[PDB]
Amino acid sequence: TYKYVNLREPSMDMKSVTDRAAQTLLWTELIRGLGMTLSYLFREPATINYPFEKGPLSPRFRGEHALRRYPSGEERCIACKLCEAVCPAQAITIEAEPRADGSRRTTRYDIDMTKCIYCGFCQEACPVDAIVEGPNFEFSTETHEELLYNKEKLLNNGDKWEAEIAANIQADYLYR
Amino acid sequence: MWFEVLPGIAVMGVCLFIPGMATARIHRFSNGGREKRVAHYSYQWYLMERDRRVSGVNRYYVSKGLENID
Amino acid sequence: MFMINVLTLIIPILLAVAFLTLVERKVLGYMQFRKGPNVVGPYGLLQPIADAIKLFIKEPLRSISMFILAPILALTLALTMWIPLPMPYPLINMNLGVLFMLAMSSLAVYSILWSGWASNSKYALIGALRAVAQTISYEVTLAIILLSVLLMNGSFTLSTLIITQEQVWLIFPAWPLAMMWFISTLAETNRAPFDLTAGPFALFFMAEYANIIMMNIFTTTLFLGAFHNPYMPELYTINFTIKSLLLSITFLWIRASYPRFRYDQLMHLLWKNFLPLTLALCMWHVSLPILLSSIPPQT
Amino acid sequence: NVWAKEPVLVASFAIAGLAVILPTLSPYTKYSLMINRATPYNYPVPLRDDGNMPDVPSHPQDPQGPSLEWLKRL
Amino acid sequence: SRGEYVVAKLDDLINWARRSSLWPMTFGLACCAVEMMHMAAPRYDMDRFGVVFRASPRQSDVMIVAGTLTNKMAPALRKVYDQMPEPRYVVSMGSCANGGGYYHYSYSVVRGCDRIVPVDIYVPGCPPTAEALLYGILQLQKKIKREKRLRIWYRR
Amino acid sequence: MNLMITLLTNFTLATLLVTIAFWLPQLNVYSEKPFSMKFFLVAITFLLFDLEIALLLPLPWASQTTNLNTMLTMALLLIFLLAVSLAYEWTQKGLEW
Amino acid sequence: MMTYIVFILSIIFVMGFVGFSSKPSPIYGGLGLIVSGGVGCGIVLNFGGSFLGLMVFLIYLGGMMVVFGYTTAMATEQYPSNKVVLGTFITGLLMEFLMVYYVLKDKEVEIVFKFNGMGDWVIYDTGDSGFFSEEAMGIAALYSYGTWLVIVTGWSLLIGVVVIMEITRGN
Ligand code: SF4
Ligand code: SF4
Ligand code: SF4
Q: Where is the secretion signal located (chain F)?
């Protein structure tokens, strides 16, 4: 099963050789190339006007690294360190202490947005879907200090929108 | 579409239109309305010099038509 | 009024080249699927103006006299080379102007070599030496083809040329000669497919694109156009301007499409394809008026 | 043959050979010679009358001398 | 007061002319170069903003470091960085560039690009989306809007 | 002298453009830090064809004279000699790469 | 800006010749000779001059200095002044100023000649009916009259081509 190419000889019939000679000395297929480029000139461009028209995306985009909390309740996090156990860049840093109430919680929960390669393993490895990849794309921060998110940064980040993340999860809790 | 490339074409064509219009109006404006006498040959320059001489205005384009017959 | 004529020539060269840059960028954009540029202001005019400004405020660094003397020659050619171009009434009625075109193209070759010497002993200057060699390999072709297309016009005066173009265009008695000459205009403008190749970059860039507009205006005058009706020259000005604009868009449009040559393929192609064909078409144009009994009125 | 090898060379030698040979066939080279000889530049001089010539017409209106009439008749 | 008015309007004019176009040079080692080429795409034009890809270093306005810097690359990186005009700004694109990223705990990898050049914009992502990089370039333009250069020269 | 005035105005305005390119920024901020043979053949080749162009090019001014046969003869002889020089370097494999 | 505009352009012409015959570096010499060729073209076009001066300007400036600077740049270096060069320029400038002194402040200047240094509108024609040029039918000879001369000229140039390729490794 094969199809090898460049099987034509230059035909020594006078018609084909004078057509190639007129092609050479009349500049024909160069004008054919100009015709193809004009055919793409008079089309309509596929340029979205970016700061107004934002581009299309997916329901499963991987953005913000936000956290979540229970409906009328506290943090969905447990600090069982599975996300630091699976984080391939080892960007997750967890130090955990329980409060006086008895339930297990944290102290420190750090994401190196520098080191973060944005897999989705921490989304697809947390047993309660505590840390969730956000929908957005805008981090764009001027100082290298400020791309090191702390736990309270993530809480004020995930509490900046719930219904977005919950809408995506309700759309996407069956394929995964 | 290319409706928007047409203002750039039009403005740059205005920029191409202006120097010829300015030149032609200055020739028709600073030579008494007569076209500037193009001259390449010594015959025509001698003719132009005697023309500007016989006018008395020291301008060759005044052209002093048909009055010194008497 | 004569300095006013000079100012009305060389003040629209800045606007002409800048709006040429926006026109070619927009045209390449619509050749592709791009609206570039339209966001920055109304249809992208302040973007080339303010971008030229930003290019003037770049603050660069550094032989110094040579580095002075090269772009000053380039831009004074770009200024002083629209003099006899007969938009109906030319600036100076030169008895011969086409040979002045050839001489100042050679002065542009001077400019490129002086920049290459000022580039201070670099593999870039070896490449610029090769660019000087390819640019100098073209004024043979341009002068000989220009000689033949004026041979059907008698005199060098170019007003005789605007007389000759009244009945039919001169594109019909010499179309393949015109084709080779237009490829030589692509060649002299040192742009695609004929490439490659510090500051002041605005002045050097200005010199190249004013050279482009000169070659397109001279192309439009040499081969086609309209009739010089006196006491309304603006009609000829408008029709000439429209045809020159369409030719310059076609010129950038042919630049928008093909990969650039190999240097040795460029030399090989130039000599072994244009140069015997130039000589053969030119000897046929010599023997043509004696076999049609139509030698032009050399006054 | 060589028509595929270097075709621009073949067309060049063809138009060159016709440009060389082709002036041998013309009804127009005599017209070229008459045009390019009978165009006056300098002044047509006068001369003394008493050579008693049955030529050299004394009046420019007078057609007794050799002139042109095929010009206006193309 | 009126001199302050003149300096303010002139400074705003020249900062506007700087933030007008800003053509960079595409440095681009790894797959973030492919995403730079994909923000040169028809669906996301650099050329709508005056942004032009141009590898001429001597007319580079800003510089986009994108890819994975190595020890063998870094001296040539700063040697390219210094042959640049004096108003210069750096966009670090990519998780590798803005802090080492996935190859962080490794030899032959410079930990980010803070260790070579000053950095102005950090746009993260692996790769950062062309969407996100273009948001970063707009935020760069607004950083250029807030600069008060000639006002500081006037009250100097 | 009109064209001398044009040359003077263009030269002076272009020098003012160069000095605007150089001595404009008042913000003095921080001052910081083998050849080949086949290159030479092309130039002399151009040179000799340019010389024969100089021989050819006063042709159309000459087109109004009586000795048409000698004109056409020596004109064809000049273009033929030019093409013979080209064909000589073409067949003696000179300008090749 | 006076009567002696041909004389002033002649003075700048002599200045350029002294500028490269003061023996500079050869690319500076090529610069000065470009200056000299431009102002000599100015002198001949002042005599009018319409055809031949701007004609061979193409061959001289348009064909020679480019090849000279080409070979000068590619062959040797002189890559980064001396008192002998500037001293030759001093002596040339002093002899030029001495000629200006003896022309303008005296009647005549005689080295071994008789130069009447005054307004050189003389000699000139009294505006005859030329109606073409002198140069027009002048160089529009060589074809109805020039049988032998252009034949041996083109023959010499063809021999020049074969000489050049032989020296630069014929075949
Ligand atoms: S975010 Fe999830 S996986 Fe990570 S420590 Fe908390 S509960 Fe465990
Ligand atoms: S996406 Fe990957 S690198 Fe980023 S925090 Fe989650 S597991 Fe770690
Ligand atoms: S950040 Fe990701 S996409 Fe960019 S260079 Fe590194 S591995 Fe490639």
A: none
Per-residue buried b or exposed e for C77-113, using 16+ beta carbons within 10 Å of the residue's own CB: bbbbbbbbbbbbbbbebbbbbbbbbbbbbbbbbbbbb
Tell me the chain C residues in contact with residue B23 when contact means C-beta distances shorter than 8 Å: 5, 8-9, 87, 89-91
Strands E89-93, E25-26: pairing kind: unpaired
Residue of the CA atom closest to atom 4 of ligand 1 = A83
**Which parts of chain D fold into alpha helices (H)?**
7-21, 29-37
Two tokens at E151?
């006002």
List own/partner pairs for G77-81 with CB under 8 A and 24 or more apart: G77/C121, G78/G25, G78/G26, G79/C121, G80/C63
* Distance from Cα A143 to the centre of ligand 1, integer Å: 28
Question: Touching check for E88 and chain C: CB below 8 Å?
Answer: no
Interface of C with B (CB under 8 A): 1, 4-5, 8-9, 12, 15-16, 19-20, 22-23, 26-27, 30, 35, 38, 43-45, 82, 87-91, 93, 95, 157, 159, 230, 233-234, 237-238, 240-242, 244-245, 249, 299
Best residue among A65, A81, A119, A121 to mutate for probing ligand 1's pocket (most ligand atoms within 8 Å of CB) is: A81
Q: Tell me which residue has its CA closest to atom 3 in ligand 2.
A: A116
Taking alpha carbons only, the member of C182, C94, C170 closest to residue C145 is C182
Which residue of D lies nearest to C293 if distances are taken between CA atoms?
Answer: D32
Pairwise CA distance, residues E61 & G22, whole Å:
45
Q: Give the domain G2-168 fold.
A: Four Helix Bundle (Hemerythrin (Met), subunit A) (1.20.120)
Question: What's the domain range around A77?
Answer: 64-175
Q: What does each C-alpha distance from C280 to A44, D8, D11, E151, F93 come to in angstroms?
A: 46, 10, 9, 69, 22
Distance between CA atoms of E54 and E26, rounded to whole angstroms? 7
Query: Structure resolution in Å?
Result: 4.1
The pair of three-digit structure tokens given for residue C243, joined into one six-digit string: 């045809």
List the domain boundaries for chain G.
2-168
At a CB cut-off of 8 Å and minimum separation 6, what does C28 contact?
A: C34, C36, C252, C256
Inter-residue contact C199 to C61 (CB < 8 Å): no
Q: Which amino acid is at F62?
A: A
Burial environment of residue A35 by CB neighbours within 10 A (0 to 12, 13 to 18, 19 or more):
exposed
Q: Rounded CA gap, C141 and F33, in Å?
A: 45
3-state secondary structure of B55: helix
Q: Which ligand is nearest to the CA of A63?
A: 2
Q: Is A118 in the pocket of ligand 2 (CB under 6 A)?
A: yes
Ligand nearest to the Cα of A90, by number: 2
Residue numbers of the domain that contains E146 = 2-156
DSSP state of A95: E
CATH architecture, domain F1-92: Up-down Bundle (1.20)
Where exactly are the structural domains of chain F? 1-92
The residue with tokens 């560039």 is E97
Among candidates E19, E4, E9, which has minimal Cα distance to E138? E19
- Answer whether C71 sits within 8 Å of F18, measured CB to CB: yes
Identify the burial level of E12 via C-beta atoms within 10 angstroms of its C-beta, where 0-12 means exposed, 13-18 middle and 19 or more buried: middle
Distance from CA of F40 to the nearest CA of C (A): 9
Q: Nearest chain C Cα to A40, which residue? A: C31
Using CA atoms, how far apart are residues C151 and C141, in angstroms rounded to an integer? 15
C-alpha neighbours within 13 Å on the C-beta side of residue C84: 19
In this structure, the dihedral spanned by the alpha carbons of residues C109, C111, C115 and C118, taken in order and rounded to 10 degrees, is 110
* CA neighbours closer than 13 Å in the CB half-sphere of residue E112: 19
* Residue C135: domain span: 1-299
Q: Is A92 in the pocket of ligand 2 (CB under 6 A)?
A: yes
**Residue corresponding to tokens 């499963």:** A60
CB distance A85 to ligand 2 below 6 Å: no
